[model samples]
Target: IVGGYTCAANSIPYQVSLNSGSHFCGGSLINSQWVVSAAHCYKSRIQVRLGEHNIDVLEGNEQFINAAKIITHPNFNGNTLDNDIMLIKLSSPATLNSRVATVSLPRSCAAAGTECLISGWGNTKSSGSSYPSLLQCLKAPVLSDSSCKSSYPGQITGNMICVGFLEGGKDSCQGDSGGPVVCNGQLQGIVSWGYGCAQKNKPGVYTKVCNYVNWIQQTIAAN
Candidate 1:
């Protein structure tokens, strides 16, 4: 993120690191064995590391587990960036403790111009080539659906929402995809895609989590 700084370790316990031998995307541990992330983040397989702080070192609170299943949205689109959500099942359920917890799903859609939190180990800047080993965080304001449409012109679908600054220099960039967008301490969005990192009038776009609440509940119940 261009205008974010490092966050305290384990500050966001629900945050998980998604990797395929290396960190590729961020995820949220929705429950003991279930995780929510962007479908685009998983190509074929993944491994989830929970309670992670610094990826360079192993902490006793960390829970490293193998991802046993990848449940992508049936209508996920790589071209249009639609239905980009996914659910990951771990080999075993995680144990809830101080180092790990589940985030609450929003009871309603996120309101426009609300303060939201986004954290990840994504690159510090759009031009940067590497992701930071320590997690980074940023505070962003949610943009209205109409204004978001203005920024993307037919790209912001009903299933997506925009967040960030119009003045630019503030956003979650590469390696930040699939992270959580927490609003009022609830899971409101999933870091799905964007035009670029902190570009002018191009705020970060995400999958509207509220739109998939029913789907998530149904899937979890079935499994």
Candidate 2:
């Protein structure tokens, strides 16, 4: 995250690292065995690591497990990047503790201008290998749907929300995809995409989690 700071240790218990030998995407543990991420982060082999504060070191508090199943939004559109959410069922439930816990899913949609926390190990720079070992966080405000649509024109949809300053100094970047965007202690959005990290008039785009609450619950129950 550009223009962000390192997260306090164990402050974000719901955060998880999606790894295939190494960290690739970020995720949120919404339940004992279910994780919320972006469909674009999908891979056949994904190891979810909970209780992780630093990716470069072996934080003994961490719990690593394989993803038993991955379910992507059926209507996900790659071209327009709509319906980009995805769910992963862990092979076994993660033990709940101070360092590993679930985050509450939002009961309602967050209003425009709602300030939210976006945390991840995404690159700090707009390009290149500036991915941080320690998780980074930034405070961003949700932009109005009209403003978001205007920013991306036809590419923005109801399934997406924009968060950040239009003048741009902070944003979720590469490797942050599928990370949590929390507002009022509830999961509100999923890091999806952006034009460029911390770019002017180009805020980071996220998958609107509120629109998929029912689908998430139903999928978890049926699976």
Candidate 3:
């Protein structure tokens, strides 16, 4: 969340925190019992916190729920960061409210230049760690696949999407992995990997949500 502002409280109802003992990654509530995240963020034990604004406060709106199952993409490649999406099933369904709701999935792939909103509690400083208590929000524009490939040759793939400023200083950073990159009120992508926080010509890369729509649907239906 470098070069971003604190998100408006309860404005991002679908934003969630993936925690073990504390916040390690950010996630989105896609349904009452399902969460969409990045496979790289998976850990041994995880608890999903929905309706969260400030992680430091005991806001009554927050719902601390455990994960019943975590299924990562079968072909996910950690080294190259391909197929980085993951699904987390909640132990119990979350009670939806104004502060906790689901975000719709994208029907089509996000095109280049489509501006989107990214929210998370990732590091505020690009050089070092400085986790904000409040969630941070940033607006970034999607980059063309050709341009993304040029920036990181042999790395960009169809399963990934890139977004941010080519000139630098606005992106999702450390601890923001698995967070949502939403466009037009739809879940477009999830924070996955990057060269660095908001580096010039090296925009943040995400798991292309559109590519896994069928997999997500099938997994949720069968589980």
Model 2 lDDT tens row, 12-107? 999999999899999999999999999999999999999999888997999999999999999998888999999999999999999999999999
Sort the predicted structures by TM-score, highest score first. 3, 2, 1
Give one digit per residue, the lDDT tens place, for model 1 in 1-223: 6689888878999999998889999999989999999999875768799999998788788888888888999999889889999999998999999889999988999899999999998888776556788889899989988889999997889999998988889999889999999999999989877777888988899899999999999888888
Q: In model 2, what lDDT does residue 205 have?
A: 96
Q: List the residue pairs that clash in candidate 1.
A: none
Model 3 regions lying over 4 Å from their true place: none
Per-candidate clashes come to 0, 0, 0
Q: lDDT of each model, Cα atoms only?
A: 0.89, 0.94, 0.94
Taking all chains together, the TM-score of candidate 3 against the true structure is 0.99
60 Cα displacement, candidate 2 (Å) = 1.1
TM-score of each: 0.97, 0.98, 0.99
